[PDB]
Amino acid sequence: CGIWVRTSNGGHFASPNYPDSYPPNKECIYILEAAPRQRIELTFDERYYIEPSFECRFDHLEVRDGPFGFSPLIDRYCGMKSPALIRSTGRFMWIKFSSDEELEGLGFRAKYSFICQFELSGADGIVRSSQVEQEEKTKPGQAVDCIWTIKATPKAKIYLRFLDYQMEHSNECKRNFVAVYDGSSAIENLKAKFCSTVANDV
């Protein structure tokens, strides 16, 4: 499903097999990345203009601003109506399209226009703790948070082991916590979040 649309002033973004009905059982990610100081304007072209009398799940196109996952929910679109054009300066509109086990529709057509995350992949390695004074030097005073992206070798599931874990600042986590996400980086599925003395391997 992946159509890497990175680094375009504008470009085509659409559901798979667009002029046909989208395939079933498809949970494929899309990501829109904007260079610093830019603005993202997402143009969305509906294929079919009717007014539904209901809103339902099982086929939903939501929009997220920021680290997919952390990104606060913007809205969750479905049906056959054209969503209104979204203008934000969050610089990261990352959008996921889902699929149920049946009941495909006319799909969708869209158009993107343009006006703390460090890559860490390979076969093995270590995420340096609080390694923030080199990547994105953030002053200690404010709350800080960062995400880390792993990519194993092709055909390789991954196992993690924590070598040192101590979040002094609480037992609870309303301020500070460490969590792991499986699949791709969304709020879809917390593999686990760690708030206590010990952090188990995963």
């Binding site: 339902c56 099982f58 009941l103």
Partner: protein, 51 residues
């Protein structure tokens, strides 16, 4: 209630299969009955479980 227009029970029948609703009564001019049985079969509802 069947949607008044579009004769499209795909939303409706999906709702039905969600609840595992293994019994149905109908009420319709038999044209709709035929036109909806084909829908049911296409949705795969046609299994010996439903009566």
């Amino acid at each position: 209630q069947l949607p008044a227009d579009t004769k499209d029970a795909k939303p409706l029948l999906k709702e039905m299969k969600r609840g595992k609703e293994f019994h149905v009564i109908f009420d319709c001019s038999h044209e709709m009955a035929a036109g909806i049985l084909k829908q049911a079969l296409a949705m795969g509802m046609m299994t010996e479980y439903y009566h």
